Design a protein around this nucleic acid. Structure first.
Ligand SMILES: [Ca+2]
Ligand SMILES: [Mg+2]
Ligand SMILES: [Mg+2]
Length: 430
DNA sequence: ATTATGACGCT
DNA sequence: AGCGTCATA
C-alpha cells in the first residue's frame, strides 16, 4: 500500500524531430516543402537507398529502408534529395550540424541526453517545480497546451481529430487538482506546458517541427512521443499505463524490439506488455537474468529508473563504408586508398570537434567485414590515437588489420573486404 | 546490395 | 579488450 513505489518521482520528456533529414532538406530547398519527398543516399544501385520520408510520401506507402526505384513505383511524383558525397562516401555533416541547432535550443530549458541525431531526453522535474511556484495554485488553461494529446482520453459517457484532442484535454484538465504541488498528474501537465514552449522555440528558431512525449520516465516518454506524430505531443500518465499496456505488443517498448523481446513472447507465451504483470520478479529474473528481470517487473507497471544523462555530445566519432557485392576491396592499394578517405573525413570531424568542444580522442578503433560473414563486423581492433592526422591514422589502421589478409600474395586482399570502419573514442578534456 | 552511424551490455 | 545487441536518420 503506502510503501509501493509508483515511479512517479520524475517528469521526463522525449523530443523527436519529425522526418528529420527531410525537414533539413526542405528548409534548404523550398521546392520540396509540402511535398511527397524523401532523402536518398547514393543512386546507381536501384536509385539509391531511402533513409527519410515525408509524411505526404508515407501516405503512398513509401518507407525508409526502401530503394528509390521501388518507392517511385508507389509514388511516381516522389521528390528526392541526395545525401552529400565527399571523398567517395556519404557525408552526414549537414544533418549533424542541424542536430546541434536543435540540441542547443533544448539545452536552454534543461539538461538533455542526446539519444540520437534527432532526439533528446529532458529531465523536467526541477523546471516543473519552478513553474509550479510561479503559477501559485492557478489552473492550467487548455490554451497553454495547443498541441497536446492526453493518452487514454476522452473516455466514458464529434467525429474530427482536433475535436477529439480537445475533448480529451478538457477531461484531463477538468479532473486535475492544481491545489497540490506534489501531484504527479499536475507535474506532468506542467511538464507538457514547458514542452509546448520548447517545441515552439525549436520551430521558431530553426524552422523544424517535432513531436514529444511527456511521462515519468524515458521508456514511457519515448512511447508517448510516437503515439501522435507528426507535430504533436502526448502525455502518458501513470494511470494510463494499464489500459495502454493491455494491448501493447512487447516489441514496441524500447529495448524489447529484438531477440530479448522475442524470447519474452516465446518463453512466457504472452503478446502484450500488460501480461507481464502476472509474473513474479523472481520468475522474470529466472528467464531473462537478474537485471532484465527486475527491469521488466517494474517496466510492465510503468516504472523505470534509468536517468536522463547529462550528455549533449556524442561519445564517439566514426566513419564507415560498405563495399558490397562486386565492389568489395580485393587489392592492397584499394584498401589503403579507402582507409585514407575514411581517415580524412575522420580528421576533419575530429579537428572541428576539438575546437568546438574542448576535448581530444585518444583511441582509434578499426573494424572490417569480410565477404561471407553474416555479422555486421567480423573484426574490431583498437590502437592509440595520438595525433589528428589522416595519413597516420590510415597507416595505423592498415597495420592493425594487415594480417587479416589470407592472401599469399601481399598485393591482393582475400577474402575481399566488404566494410571499413574507423572510430575515435575515449575522449579527454583539452 | 539499405547504409551510416552511435550507446550500452557481456565476459 | 573484443564481441554482441539494439537503436537512430
Ligand atoms: Ca524523428
Ligand atoms: Mg528519432
Ligand atoms: Mg525514424
Amino acid at each position: 500500500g503506502p510503501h509501493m513505489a509508483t515511479g512517479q518521482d520524475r517528469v521526463v520528456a522525449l523530443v523527436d524531430m519529425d522526418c528529420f533529414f527531410v525537414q533539413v532538406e526542405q528548409r534548404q530547398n523550398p521546392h520540396l516543402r509540402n511535398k511527397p519527398c524523401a532523402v536518398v543516399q547514393y543512386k546507381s544501385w536501384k536509385g539509391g537507398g531511402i533513409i527519410a520520408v515525408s509524411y505526404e510520401a508515407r501516405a503512398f506507402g513509401v518507407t525508409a529502408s526502401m530503394w528509390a526505384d521501388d518507392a517511385k513505383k508507389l509514388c511516381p511524383d516522389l521528390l528526392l534529395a541526395q545525401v552529400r558525397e565527399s571523398r567517395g562516401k556519404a557525408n552526414l555533416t549537414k544533418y549533424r550540424e542541424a542536430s546541434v541547432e536543435v540540441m542547443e535550443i533544448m539545452s536552454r530549458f534543461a539538461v538533455i541526453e542526446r539519444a540520437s541525431i534527432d532526439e533528446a531526453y529532458v529531465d523536467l522535474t526541477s523546471a516543473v517545480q519552478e513553474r509550479l511556484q510561479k503559477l501559485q495554485g492557478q489552473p492550467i488553461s487548455a490554451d497553454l497546451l495547443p498541441s497536446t494529446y492526453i493518452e487514454g482520453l476522452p473516455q466514458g459517457p464529434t467525429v474530427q481529430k482536433e475535436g477529439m484532442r480537445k475533448q480529451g484535454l478538457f477531461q484531463w484538465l477538468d479532473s486535475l487538482q492544481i491545489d497540490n504541488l506534489t501531484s504527479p498528474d499536475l507535474q506532468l501537465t506542467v511538464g507538457a506546458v514547458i514542452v509546448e514552449e520548447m517545441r515552439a522555440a525549436i520551430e521558431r528558431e530553426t524552422g523544424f517541427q517535432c513531436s514529444a512525449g511527456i511521462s515519468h520516465n524515458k521508456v514511457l516518454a519515448k512511447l508517448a512521443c510516437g503515439l501522435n506524430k507528426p507535430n504533436r505531443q502526448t502525455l502518458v500518465s501513470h494511470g494510463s499505463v494499464p489500459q495502454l499496456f493491455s494491448q501493447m505488443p512487447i516489441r514496441k517498448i524500447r529495448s524489447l524490439g529484438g531477440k530479448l523481446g522475442a524470447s519474452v513472447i516465446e518463453i512466457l507465451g504472452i503478446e502484450y506488455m500488460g501480461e507481464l504483470t502476472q509474473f513474479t520478479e523472481s520468475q522474470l529474473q529466472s528467464h531473462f537474468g537478474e537485471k532484465n528481470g527486475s527491469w521488466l517487473y517494474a517496466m510492465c507497471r510503468g516504472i523505470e529508473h534509468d536517468p536522463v544523462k547529462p550528455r549533449q555530445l556524442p561519445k564517439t566519432i566514426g566513419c564507415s563504408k560498405n563495399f558490397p557485392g562486386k565492389t568489395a576491396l580485393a587489392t592492397r592499394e584499394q584498401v589503403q586508398w579507402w582507409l585514407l578517405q575514411l581517415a580524412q573525413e575522420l580528421e576533419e570531424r575530429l579537428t572541428k570537434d576539438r575546437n568546438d568542444n574542448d576535448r581530444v580522442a585518444t583511441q582509434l578503433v578499426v573494424s572490417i567485414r569480410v565477404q561471407g560473414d553474416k555479422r555486421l563486423s567480423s573484426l574490431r581492433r583498437c590502437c592509440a590515437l595520438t595525433r589528428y592526422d589522416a595519413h597516420k591514422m590510415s597507416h595505423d589502421a592498415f597495420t592493425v588489420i594487415k594480417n587479416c589478409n589470407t592472401s599469399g600474395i601481399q598485393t591482393e586482399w582475400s577474402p575481399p573486404l566488404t566494410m571499413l570502419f574507423l572510430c575515435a573514442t575515449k575522449f579527454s578534456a583539452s
